[PDB]
Amino acid sequence: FRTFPGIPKWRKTHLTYRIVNYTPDLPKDAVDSAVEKALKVWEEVTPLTFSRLYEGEADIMISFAVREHGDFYPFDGPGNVLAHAYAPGPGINGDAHFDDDEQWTKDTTGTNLFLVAAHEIGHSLGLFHSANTEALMYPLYHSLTDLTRFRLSQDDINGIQSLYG
């Protein structure tokens, strides 16, 4: 497993999140559930807890966007980069942004929202990329994971326990 340089991490155990806007690609309900399921994967193996906000600034702000959207890293249209998340800390830190030029599905063939969201939150909690082929944090996880058999690897679990306990 790998962490980000200097090992940034959250200094409280109770975190909040807000879903700012929605993709045209799926129904609202389908989006809420992909996101709640992604957060539960990580809540099971750490002493952190998550709660939702509908107004104000939450620790993790989630939003959908295309091309330039307010930071140093512009989206690139269809394919290539699919999303991007920042390491723990104030302001933009911890936030996750999804490229709306991709086609978000609930399918096992295509760009799955739940899968990508579980990987990006890993970044938001403090983990970088792994070299273990079975890991949720290996760079090619989106092509290699069988959603019928989904599970965090031992490497994922080892990595998150070294930061949070």
Ligand SMILES: CNC(=O)[C@H](Cc1c(F)c(F)c(F)c(F)c1F)NC(=O)Nc1nnc(S)s1
């Ligand atoms: C403390 N360092 C970070 O928080 C970096 C900052 C950062 C960017 F956010 C970024 F978009 C980018 F292109 C960079 F080159 C870059 F350095 N965050 C991540 O690499 N996030 C990722 N999300 N999904 C991945 S797959 S990798």
Ligand SMILES: [Ca+2]
């Ligand atoms: Ca934030």
Ligand SMILES: [Ca+2]
């Ligand atoms: Ca793209």
Ligand SMILES: [Ca+2]
């Ligand atoms: Ca789209």
Ligand SMILES: [Zn+2]
């Ligand atoms: Zn507190």
Ligand SMILES: [Zn+2]
């Ligand atoms: Zn961004």
Ligand SMILES: [Zn+2]
């Ligand atoms: Zn990544």
